[PDB]
């Protein structure tokens, strides 16, 4: 017989699809890591050596996109001992995360952009999709090529820049160095076909989002490029966060923080405030920070609580972790399960507990446990 | 019905397939820009929406990989007027080029790596496969990030560094600066999963390859990383290149030079010298000088016609040999898994159709896909 | 017999302990430069080759911590002839100083951070404990590694940064370069486990502490990290100094200046103003600046006047020179005579005149005169 | 009663003490992380709150000092996937390592000295003794402060500089750059009270130690500062290392290499060659490649078992020899004053308990003290 295994044909059939839009019992045919067909009842013989897997009674949805993860590690705020380790592949996949954006935090003395980049590429070769934000809390930005504009333009995996404001660990930037910073990420993004976004690490200062509004006054970076994070870290900052989203911005809630505004409660209050889910993202702030290193569970736990204790549909709870993120970061072929896109799907149960995970066509999670891991796990 | 055109299924059937190694009348199933099947006589209905194409009586081989092109332009060796223009996509796809390695030449004052990088990425978006070499004739090299090792390492499209020796347009580099440069390209390559080569532009100096030998003494960079080009520019130098190839090194012959050693005459003499074709590649140095890419296909033709090379062996220096030197995974060879970079030729080797990563570039010998502003 | 001299056992017994908290006739057993026992009536045989020294009728208290000393020298404001010499070990110890923080002043053209560091280490090897502040009057800061954040983070003996404001010898810094400066010392401190404090050299400008309040408005560095010095150099600056301490800051008075507010009068006015002694430090401004080079006597002379002409208890007068300083600079094992801490103690008379001085277990002052000195004294 | 536990008194009694020089059944009194007494039969009540521990029938020797560890990680010589993780505290303490010297290898693009410095300091806080070498295979060296001399001089944990020669992953360094580098490490060391050594990663080049000899001609850096490593990587080179050791220099053998010259086979041949063990140390190159530290204890064991070295002489290359080369005051030797870095072994040399600066690291052969995130 002729050999067609190169195509890596796979037929996910029988599941109740959520792409994330509620579909019904639909099927998904994969070929070469890409979704090439989405329609109910696809013939199992339609293509050669097709690995047909029956997901009858299962839920099929798009893989998670985590845009706030300390891939190479973080912490260090309480001494060099508090420097957390690098994130393990399996730790992500088992959490549903198929796409991830890495950034740096407080420490940019013992943590470097070239280290984040290399790692970002390790994960890519290992099967998932990884990107990174140049810079860190400190402003001006310590970068790779010498300028933020240049990094976001010429370093492929860089899609924007990070920074901290209204935090006692800030670098104390002025509206000038902050506006210039966001402008370079914008321009560079245009030149390199990247989102060119600016992600602000929100602290607890009373000024809250003030630095941002000042920036909008001092330049012409679209409000759709600024992304405040950890918005649910204190009530008045979350209140302001809602007002921000109202004027067109997209806010980012972190699941790793439970008080004084829980993740689920945050996404819920947003809807109640009339913000389209499209402008609401949920990130994990994974591997940063007993002293304890943050994990990626709270993500799925948000989707669950959203469907179980708030009335969000499965389709809606998925958005802030899928379609919303890919949309804000212009992640082509991601967050959506439509023909053409990548095969980043998760197999779950109707109780929303992950069973299988597919990244670009490969099986990362076979039974809720990773069958694929980092080279030294 | 259900929609499967997302997979862009295409079946090239009934052609005399050379991959380059002469197979028979083989069929090639393509899906998502990938060759997913190669076995004679494949069903025209094996896969759903399959664009089936009848290539009966035609030749099918891998597209050419040209590793010496001044993508953003070159020249300038006689004033700013002599600065050649950038390369047009259709120009490449029509000469049967599906993968190319850009680089800079003498002028590295009005030509910068950031621009080349940009042009390389623009080409990849448009349909073909492009990479680039950092630096230029100048040593030490004007890089993007500060060091050659860092460029090759972290700039995704840099596969090695370029430079110029035994030429009257060099920077008069000394063995140490030279050695260090290559070592950085080599180390960088390992860190970036790049071949980490060092391409040497050869001039007409009596010294010829002496600097490349001098380098071997002062460092440990494998000889499989040192690639001299334009070896066919003067006979005394060509002779040495052959001796260099006999030692395990690879040599690059430029199809844009027709004397004293013509391209074909070059690839030919190597075989006679007893050099596995594996260590011989053919580059165009297109858009240099204004050089064109016609001479690549012409060197194949003439090799099969004027000289007595076979279609398969003639193709090698322009495909598999090149692919194996830069470690361009998935190219220069037609097998399941590799990229659907294909060329449909007549029995007389006259490119009719061209495929790049699945997409059809040349329809009637004339590109049907072009750059944004052609 | 077996040899136990390696332990360097020493029993300070019979004295009236002040740790600085008023204890009674307590004893202090040292071993390996560390205090390993504090309790009344410790048996003299308790450990092997214990050098028992009878401090009967004597006062035992913690060694002085001097956080403002020009170790490599200073001055120069009236020409290169006015460049003062380096501080001598014995000059410090004989003043009670067992721990010291070095900084630079007006001159940062002929005075360098690497020189302060080396010296800071000479003193460490010679028996006492020394630290240093990166930078000088001039802002931005001339540093060791290129950034204030990096110095405070990666150069072990650097614990913060120095600067001058409201002074005719300033570098004329703006709230921006001043806030950024304090933020880097803060972050770097976190990363390297250092206080990460910013010490301001107060001048005589009418604006007084204004630059500081502006800084608090332009960033989120805690007010507990800013330290204004020479606060008693003019009445309205000292007045403001009191208000500052009230809002949470810790002020630093310099004993070397007697008018228009004396050291003792300054520490006293502070108490009278309701400031906890914990937020009041006294430094000497030693070796900076006939033209005369400043000395370290005024320190003890403050403790004395505090107990003799104001009613401060011996225990209280010691705080602003011991427990207060160690607390503000998070000097572990210092300022406190409790088990675990270092053996930096002074032997005095009930009239508060130094007799003996111990630094990390060694005897620096045997009879009010140093029995240990700098390699070239 | 009065509280004296601040001194953390501990008495290790009735063990067969090797310091490493074979003493008899000696007792060791520890106080404040310091060995304050070493004389057979010490009172279990000599000092107040004394944690007395019965080590009857057990061996007691100094903890190992491993001077070749990629603390923050290494590798990367085959893409970013091959970048090894950082070292775990328990991993070290379980292999009997109480003092370690971190360093960087080939990758000095995604691995920086500031991180190593940070990891070194984190280790010291956690219980063990750590130092680091500045630079990497690359020459000139990528430092923290701008110059090697300045790094070794003012960065408190840098004791010298590293680099790579006669290897195919070097930076192709020339005698001048090399010499200058070592001279800076040497001068720096004097200014910082550091050994100021220069550790050379040895490759598989025919040249072998020739660069180290070439260096001796062009400068005056004492030969007691030049330390080559991995000398047991190829026999021709090993032979030279021995000749180098016969001239007063020290050689480092990596326990992570088992052919052509195994570790034991290496330490053994040196003795036969008539080299005082003083000039021979054993390193692991742990977390390199992913390399582990088991081979350190295994090289001791095998030395006492397979070969005919005594327990005392076997330990030397892993303690006193190392300590005496880096001038690590107070380590590698059990005497009053020195640090309480101890290893309780069975008669068959199987680490049972481990002590680092007084604190107990390994209880039942398994660390009972770990890094913050293990």
PDB file of C-alpha atoms in Angstrom, chain B residues 106-332:
ATOM      1  CA  UNK B 106      30.659  45.122  -1.120  1.00  0.00           C
ATOM      2  CA  UNK B 107      28.362  47.986  -0.149  1.00  0.00           C
ATOM      3  CA  UNK B 108      27.564  47.819   3.550  1.00  0.00           C
ATOM      4  CA  UNK B 109      27.154  51.580   4.014  1.00  0.00           C
ATOM      5  CA  UNK B 110      23.956  52.090   2.049  1.00  0.00           C
ATOM      6  CA  UNK B 111      22.799  48.480   2.568  1.00  0.00           C
ATOM      7  CA  UNK B 112      21.955  47.205   6.051  1.00  0.00           C
ATOM      8  CA  UNK B 113      21.103  43.723   7.492  1.00  0.00           C
ATOM      9  CA  UNK B 114      17.824  45.050   8.933  1.00  0.00           C
ATOM     10  CA  UNK B 115      16.623  45.754   5.415  1.00  0.00           C
ATOM     11  CA  UNK B 116      17.731  42.336   4.143  1.00  0.00           C
ATOM     12  CA  UNK B 117      16.017  40.710   7.130  1.00  0.00           C
ATOM     13  CA  UNK B 118      12.907  42.674   6.214  1.00  0.00           C
ATOM     14  CA  UNK B 119      13.070  41.659   2.545  1.00  0.00           C
ATOM     15  CA  UNK B 120      13.640  38.046   3.558  1.00  0.00           C
ATOM     16  CA  UNK B 121      10.520  38.036   5.723  1.00  0.00           C
ATOM     17  CA  UNK B 122       8.507  39.791   3.023  1.00  0.00           C
ATOM     18  CA  UNK B 123       9.484  37.047   0.604  1.00  0.00           C
ATOM     19  CA  UNK B 124       8.374  34.280   2.992  1.00  0.00           C
ATOM     20  CA  UNK B 125       4.963  35.927   3.362  1.00  0.00           C
ATOM     21  CA  UNK B 126       4.611  36.102  -0.397  1.00  0.00           C
ATOM     22  CA  UNK B 127       5.086  32.375  -0.907  1.00  0.00           C
ATOM     23  CA  UNK B 128       8.722  31.255  -1.020  1.00  0.00           C
ATOM     24  CA  UNK B 129      11.343  30.204   1.530  1.00  0.00           C
ATOM     25  CA  UNK B 130      13.995  32.789   2.412  1.00  0.00           C
ATOM     26  CA  UNK B 131      16.909  33.057   4.821  1.00  0.00           C
ATOM     27  CA  UNK B 132      19.842  35.431   5.027  1.00  0.00           C
ATOM     28  CA  UNK B 133      23.530  35.649   5.901  1.00  0.00           C
ATOM     29  CA  UNK B 134      24.620  38.434   8.256  1.00  0.00           C
ATOM     30  CA  UNK B 135      27.616  40.688   7.602  1.00  0.00           C
ATOM     31  CA  UNK B 136      29.131  41.641   4.238  1.00  0.00           C
ATOM     32  CA  UNK B 137      32.566  41.746   2.574  1.00  0.00           C
ATOM     33  CA  UNK B 138      33.521  43.743   5.676  1.00  0.00           C
ATOM     34  CA  UNK B 139      35.331  42.225   8.666  1.00  0.00           C
ATOM     35  CA  UNK B 140      34.693  42.621  11.464  1.00  0.00           C
ATOM     36  CA  UNK B 141      31.042  42.274  10.450  1.00  0.00           C
ATOM     37  CA  UNK B 142      28.386  44.952  10.707  1.00  0.00           C
ATOM     38  CA  UNK B 143      25.680  42.966  12.449  1.00  0.00           C
ATOM     39  CA  UNK B 144      22.122  43.551  13.631  1.00  0.00           C
ATOM     40  CA  UNK B 145      22.497  42.665  17.307  1.00  0.00           C
ATOM     41  CA  UNK B 146      26.118  43.454  18.100  1.00  0.00           C
ATOM     42  CA  UNK B 147      27.869  40.160  17.397  1.00  0.00           C
ATOM     43  CA  UNK B 148      27.795  37.551  14.645  1.00  0.00           C
ATOM     44  CA  UNK B 149      27.262  34.797  17.209  1.00  0.00           C
ATOM     45  CA  UNK B 150      24.232  36.659  18.571  1.00  0.00           C
ATOM     46  CA  UNK B 151      22.804  37.325  15.095  1.00  0.00           C
ATOM     47  CA  UNK B 152      23.078  33.710  13.951  1.00  0.00           C
ATOM     48  CA  UNK B 153      21.845  32.665  17.374  1.00  0.00           C
ATOM     49  CA  UNK B 154      18.741  34.770  17.968  1.00  0.00           C
ATOM     50  CA  UNK B 155      17.732  36.402  14.663  1.00  0.00           C
ATOM     51  CA  UNK B 156      15.378  33.760  13.280  1.00  0.00           C
ATOM     52  CA  UNK B 157      16.375  34.124   9.593  1.00  0.00           C
ATOM     53  CA  UNK B 158      20.161  34.286   9.870  1.00  0.00           C
ATOM     54  CA  UNK B 159      21.846  30.950   9.104  1.00  0.00           C
ATOM     55  CA  UNK B 160      25.454  32.095   9.093  1.00  0.00           C
ATOM     56  CA  UNK B 161      27.831  34.934   8.318  1.00  0.00           C
ATOM     57  CA  UNK B 162      29.349  36.213   5.052  1.00  0.00           C
ATOM     58  CA  UNK B 163      32.617  38.048   4.359  1.00  0.00           C
ATOM     59  CA  UNK B 164      35.253  38.601   1.691  1.00  0.00           C
ATOM     60  CA  UNK B 165      38.867  37.467   1.354  1.00  0.00           C
ATOM     61  CA  UNK B 166      41.705  37.479  -1.217  1.00  0.00           C
ATOM     62  CA  UNK B 167      39.865  40.339  -2.900  1.00  0.00           C
ATOM     63  CA  UNK B 168      40.739  43.982  -3.611  1.00  0.00           C
ATOM     64  CA  UNK B 169      37.433  45.099  -2.049  1.00  0.00           C
ATOM     65  CA  UNK B 170      37.846  43.432   1.335  1.00  0.00           C
ATOM     66  CA  UNK B 171      38.555  45.083   4.674  1.00  0.00           C
ATOM     67  CA  UNK B 172      41.979  43.424   4.674  1.00  0.00           C
ATOM     68  CA  UNK B 173      40.973  40.969   7.467  1.00  0.00           C
ATOM     69  CA  UNK B 174      43.621  39.144   9.530  1.00  0.00           C
ATOM     70  CA  UNK B 175      43.513  35.479  10.512  1.00  0.00           C
ATOM     71  CA  UNK B 176      42.383  36.210  14.060  1.00  0.00           C
ATOM     72  CA  UNK B 177      39.416  38.426  13.159  1.00  0.00           C
ATOM     73  CA  UNK B 178      38.532  35.907  10.463  1.00  0.00           C
ATOM     74  CA  UNK B 179      38.750  32.832  12.710  1.00  0.00           C
ATOM     75  CA  UNK B 180      36.784  34.527  15.501  1.00  0.00           C
ATOM     76  CA  UNK B 181      34.089  35.488  13.016  1.00  0.00           C
ATOM     77  CA  UNK B 182      33.636  31.902  11.829  1.00  0.00           C
ATOM     78  CA  UNK B 183      33.741  30.560  15.380  1.00  0.00           C
ATOM     79  CA  UNK B 184      30.907  32.909  16.313  1.00  0.00           C
ATOM     80  CA  UNK B 185      28.874  31.834  13.313  1.00  0.00           C
ATOM     81  CA  UNK B 186      29.454  28.193  14.295  1.00  0.00           C
ATOM     82  CA  UNK B 187      28.565  28.596  17.945  1.00  0.00           C
ATOM     83  CA  UNK B 188      25.608  30.808  17.064  1.00  0.00           C
ATOM     84  CA  UNK B 189      24.306  28.179  14.678  1.00  0.00           C
ATOM     85  CA  UNK B 190      24.292  25.521  17.385  1.00  0.00           C
ATOM     86  CA  UNK B 191      22.382  27.811  19.736  1.00  0.00           C
ATOM     87  CA  UNK B 192      19.898  28.687  17.045  1.00  0.00           C
ATOM     88  CA  UNK B 193      19.645  25.389  15.223  1.00  0.00           C
ATOM     89  CA  UNK B 194      21.238  27.018  12.181  1.00  0.00           C
ATOM     90  CA  UNK B 195      24.024  25.594   9.982  1.00  0.00           C
ATOM     91  CA  UNK B 196      26.246  28.405  11.273  1.00  0.00           C
ATOM     92  CA  UNK B 197      28.315  28.607   8.109  1.00  0.00           C
ATOM     93  CA  UNK B 198      30.757  31.245   6.930  1.00  0.00           C
ATOM     94  CA  UNK B 199      30.547  32.087   3.227  1.00  0.00           C
ATOM     95  CA  UNK B 200      33.723  33.574   1.767  1.00  0.00           C
ATOM     96  CA  UNK B 201      33.558  35.790  -1.292  1.00  0.00           C
ATOM     97  CA  UNK B 202      36.624  34.850  -3.301  1.00  0.00           C
ATOM     98  CA  UNK B 203      38.602  37.524  -5.098  1.00  0.00           C
ATOM     99  CA  UNK B 204      41.365  37.359  -7.690  1.00  0.00           C
ATOM    100  CA  UNK B 205      44.301  37.418  -5.300  1.00  0.00           C
ATOM    101  CA  UNK B 206      47.203  35.005  -5.714  1.00  0.00           C
ATOM    102  CA  UNK B 207      46.666  34.003  -2.081  1.00  0.00           C
ATOM    103  CA  UNK B 208      43.321  32.431  -3.027  1.00  0.00           C
ATOM    104  CA  UNK B 209      42.207  29.995  -0.303  1.00  0.00           C
ATOM    105  CA  UNK B 210      45.279  30.524   1.886  1.00  0.00           C
ATOM    106  CA  UNK B 211      43.274  32.540   4.391  1.00  0.00           C
ATOM    107  CA  UNK B 212      40.750  29.677   4.687  1.00  0.00           C
ATOM    108  CA  UNK B 213      43.606  27.258   5.350  1.00  0.00           C
ATOM    109  CA  UNK B 214      45.268  29.709   7.768  1.00  0.00           C
ATOM    110  CA  UNK B 215      41.958  29.806   9.614  1.00  0.00           C
ATOM    111  CA  UNK B 216      41.828  26.006  10.003  1.00  0.00           C
ATOM    112  CA  UNK B 217      45.130  26.185  11.909  1.00  0.00           C
ATOM    113  CA  UNK B 218      44.097  28.908  14.360  1.00  0.00           C
ATOM    114  CA  UNK B 219      40.699  27.465  15.357  1.00  0.00           C
ATOM    115  CA  UNK B 220      38.624  24.280  15.306  1.00  0.00           C
ATOM    116  CA  UNK B 221      35.636  25.269  13.187  1.00  0.00           C
ATOM    117  CA  UNK B 222      34.759  22.168  11.121  1.00  0.00           C
ATOM    118  CA  UNK B 223      35.826  22.476   7.476  1.00  0.00           C
ATOM    119  CA  UNK B 224      32.182  21.597   6.669  1.00  0.00           C
ATOM    120  CA  UNK B 225      31.252  25.165   7.640  1.00  0.00           C
ATOM    121  CA  UNK B 226      33.683  27.094   5.424  1.00  0.00           C
ATOM    122  CA  UNK B 227      32.081  27.739   2.036  1.00  0.00           C
ATOM    123  CA  UNK B 228      34.068  29.623  -0.584  1.00  0.00           C
ATOM    124  CA  UNK B 229      32.177  31.091  -3.559  1.00  0.00           C
ATOM    125  CA  UNK B 230      33.027  32.251  -7.079  1.00  0.00           C
ATOM    126  CA  UNK B 231      35.731  29.583  -7.082  1.00  0.00           C
ATOM    127  CA  UNK B 232      35.306  29.502 -10.870  1.00  0.00           C
ATOM    128  CA  UNK B 233      36.412  33.154 -11.155  1.00  0.00           C
ATOM    129  CA  UNK B 234      40.025  32.308 -12.049  1.00  0.00           C
ATOM    130  CA  UNK B 235      41.579  28.933 -12.854  1.00  0.00           C
ATOM    131  CA  UNK B 236      44.432  28.993 -10.329  1.00  0.00           C
ATOM    132  CA  UNK B 237      41.833  29.518  -7.565  1.00  0.00           C
ATOM    133  CA  UNK B 238      39.390  26.981  -9.016  1.00  0.00           C
ATOM    134  CA  UNK B 239      42.113  24.340  -8.943  1.00  0.00           C
ATOM    135  CA  UNK B 240      42.622  25.017  -5.225  1.00  0.00           C
ATOM    136  CA  UNK B 241      38.864  24.935  -4.526  1.00  0.00           C
ATOM    137  CA  UNK B 242      38.856  21.421  -5.978  1.00  0.00           C
ATOM    138  CA  UNK B 243      41.713  20.410  -3.665  1.00  0.00           C
ATOM    139  CA  UNK B 244      39.695  22.007  -0.844  1.00  0.00           C
ATOM    140  CA  UNK B 245      36.624  20.000  -1.852  1.00  0.00           C
ATOM    141  CA  UNK B 246      38.771  16.871  -1.929  1.00  0.00           C
ATOM    142  CA  UNK B 247      39.495  17.496   1.775  1.00  0.00           C
ATOM    143  CA  UNK B 248      35.853  17.339   2.831  1.00  0.00           C
ATOM    144  CA  UNK B 249      34.964  20.966   2.236  1.00  0.00           C
ATOM    145  CA  UNK B 250      32.190  22.151  -0.048  1.00  0.00           C
ATOM    146  CA  UNK B 251      32.604  24.620  -2.882  1.00  0.00           C
ATOM    147  CA  UNK B 252      30.159  27.070  -4.386  1.00  0.00           C
ATOM    148  CA  UNK B 253      30.296  27.872  -8.103  1.00  0.00           C
ATOM    149  CA  UNK B 254      28.511  30.980  -9.364  1.00  0.00           C
ATOM    150  CA  UNK B 255      26.371  30.517 -12.455  1.00  0.00           C
ATOM    151  CA  UNK B 256      26.760  34.212 -13.168  1.00  0.00           C
ATOM    152  CA  UNK B 257      30.388  33.752 -14.246  1.00  0.00           C
ATOM    153  CA  UNK B 258      31.113  32.155 -17.646  1.00  0.00           C
ATOM    154  CA  UNK B 259      34.925  32.337 -17.799  1.00  0.00           C
ATOM    155  CA  UNK B 260      37.621  31.162 -17.322  1.00  0.00           C
ATOM    156  CA  UNK B 261      35.592  28.344 -15.833  1.00  0.00           C
ATOM    157  CA  UNK B 262      31.974  28.256 -16.956  1.00  0.00           C
ATOM    158  CA  UNK B 263      29.337  26.951 -14.520  1.00  0.00           C
ATOM    159  CA  UNK B 264      28.785  23.592 -16.205  1.00  0.00           C
ATOM    160  CA  UNK B 265      32.505  23.367 -16.940  1.00  0.00           C
ATOM    161  CA  UNK B 266      32.882  23.853 -13.201  1.00  0.00           C
ATOM    162  CA  UNK B 267      30.460  21.250 -11.919  1.00  0.00           C
ATOM    163  CA  UNK B 268      31.915  18.962 -14.597  1.00  0.00           C
ATOM    164  CA  UNK B 269      35.618  19.310 -13.675  1.00  0.00           C
ATOM    165  CA  UNK B 270      34.727  18.579 -10.071  1.00  0.00           C
ATOM    166  CA  UNK B 271      33.283  15.164 -10.952  1.00  0.00           C
ATOM    167  CA  UNK B 272      36.305  14.351 -13.094  1.00  0.00           C
ATOM    168  CA  UNK B 273      38.424  15.370 -10.097  1.00  0.00           C
ATOM    169  CA  UNK B 274      36.436  12.769  -8.188  1.00  0.00           C
ATOM    170  CA  UNK B 275      34.411  14.994  -5.866  1.00  0.00           C
ATOM    171  CA  UNK B 276      31.076  13.696  -4.615  1.00  0.00           C
ATOM    172  CA  UNK B 277      28.455  16.078  -6.024  1.00  0.00           C
ATOM    173  CA  UNK B 278      27.330  16.343  -2.389  1.00  0.00           C
ATOM    174  CA  UNK B 279      30.151  18.831  -1.820  1.00  0.00           C
ATOM    175  CA  UNK B 280      29.251  20.996  -4.808  1.00  0.00           C
ATOM    176  CA  UNK B 281      26.551  23.666  -5.011  1.00  0.00           C
ATOM    177  CA  UNK B 282      25.639  26.261  -7.637  1.00  0.00           C
ATOM    178  CA  UNK B 283      24.703  29.864  -6.743  1.00  0.00           C
ATOM    179  CA  UNK B 284      23.613  32.788  -8.943  1.00  0.00           C
ATOM    180  CA  UNK B 285      24.794  35.887  -7.132  1.00  0.00           C
ATOM    181  CA  UNK B 286      21.668  37.367  -8.714  1.00  0.00           C
ATOM    182  CA  UNK B 287      20.983  41.092  -8.615  1.00  0.00           C
ATOM    183  CA  UNK B 288      24.697  41.616  -8.141  1.00  0.00           C
ATOM    184  CA  UNK B 289      27.228  42.749 -10.774  1.00  0.00           C
ATOM    185  CA  UNK B 290      22.791  43.501 -13.043  1.00  0.00           C
ATOM    186  CA  UNK B 291      22.917  39.691 -12.722  1.00  0.00           C
ATOM    187  CA  UNK B 292      19.906  37.483 -13.341  1.00  0.00           C
ATOM    188  CA  UNK B 293      18.810  33.971 -12.391  1.00  0.00           C
ATOM    189  CA  UNK B 294      18.449  32.508 -15.887  1.00  0.00           C
ATOM    190  CA  UNK B 295      21.946  31.001 -15.637  1.00  0.00           C
ATOM    191  CA  UNK B 296      20.809  28.544 -12.939  1.00  0.00           C
ATOM    192  CA  UNK B 297      18.390  26.647 -15.135  1.00  0.00           C
ATOM    193  CA  UNK B 298      20.806  27.059 -18.047  1.00  0.00           C
ATOM    194  CA  UNK B 299      23.579  25.377 -16.099  1.00  0.00           C
ATOM    195  CA  UNK B 300      21.332  22.362 -15.542  1.00  0.00           C
ATOM    196  CA  UNK B 301      20.204  22.178 -19.191  1.00  0.00           C
ATOM    197  CA  UNK B 302      23.730  22.547 -20.579  1.00  0.00           C
ATOM    198  CA  UNK B 303      24.932  19.941 -18.083  1.00  0.00           C
ATOM    199  CA  UNK B 304      22.461  17.380 -19.413  1.00  0.00           C
ATOM    200  CA  UNK B 305      22.937  18.526 -23.013  1.00  0.00           C
ATOM    201  CA  UNK B 306      26.479  19.728 -23.781  1.00  0.00           C
ATOM    202  CA  UNK B 307      28.152  17.626 -21.062  1.00  0.00           C
ATOM    203  CA  UNK B 308      27.082  14.101 -20.122  1.00  0.00           C
ATOM    204  CA  UNK B 309      25.461  14.531 -16.741  1.00  0.00           C
ATOM    205  CA  UNK B 310      22.080  12.982 -16.073  1.00  0.00           C
ATOM    206  CA  UNK B 311      19.015  14.989 -15.152  1.00  0.00           C
ATOM    207  CA  UNK B 312      19.246  13.692 -11.597  1.00  0.00           C
ATOM    208  CA  UNK B 313      22.972  14.414 -11.129  1.00  0.00           C
ATOM    209  CA  UNK B 314      22.629  17.813 -12.806  1.00  0.00           C
ATOM    210  CA  UNK B 315      19.957  18.922 -10.337  1.00  0.00           C
ATOM    211  CA  UNK B 316      21.921  18.015  -7.194  1.00  0.00           C
ATOM    212  CA  UNK B 317      24.221  21.091  -7.034  1.00  0.00           C
ATOM    213  CA  UNK B 318      21.039  23.181  -7.127  1.00  0.00           C
ATOM    214  CA  UNK B 319      19.001  21.149  -4.648  1.00  0.00           C
ATOM    215  CA  UNK B 320      19.990  18.320  -2.308  1.00  0.00           C
ATOM    216  CA  UNK B 321      23.652  19.430  -2.241  1.00  0.00           C
ATOM    217  CA  UNK B 322      22.616  22.944  -1.207  1.00  0.00           C
ATOM    218  CA  UNK B 323      19.948  21.642   1.163  1.00  0.00           C
ATOM    219  CA  UNK B 324      22.427  19.319   2.839  1.00  0.00           C
ATOM    220  CA  UNK B 325      24.988  22.064   3.316  1.00  0.00           C
ATOM    221  CA  UNK B 326      22.714  24.547   5.095  1.00  0.00           C
ATOM    222  CA  UNK B 327      20.736  21.764   6.710  1.00  0.00           C
ATOM    223  CA  UNK B 328      17.565  23.246   5.189  1.00  0.00           C
ATOM    224  CA  UNK B 329      15.307  20.576   6.679  1.00  0.00           C
ATOM    225  CA  UNK B 330      12.503  19.522   4.329  1.00  0.00           C
ATOM    226  CA  UNK B 331      13.901  20.929   1.093  1.00  0.00           C
ATOM    227  CA  UNK B 332      15.815  20.033  -2.053  1.00  0.00           C
TER     228      UNK B 332
END
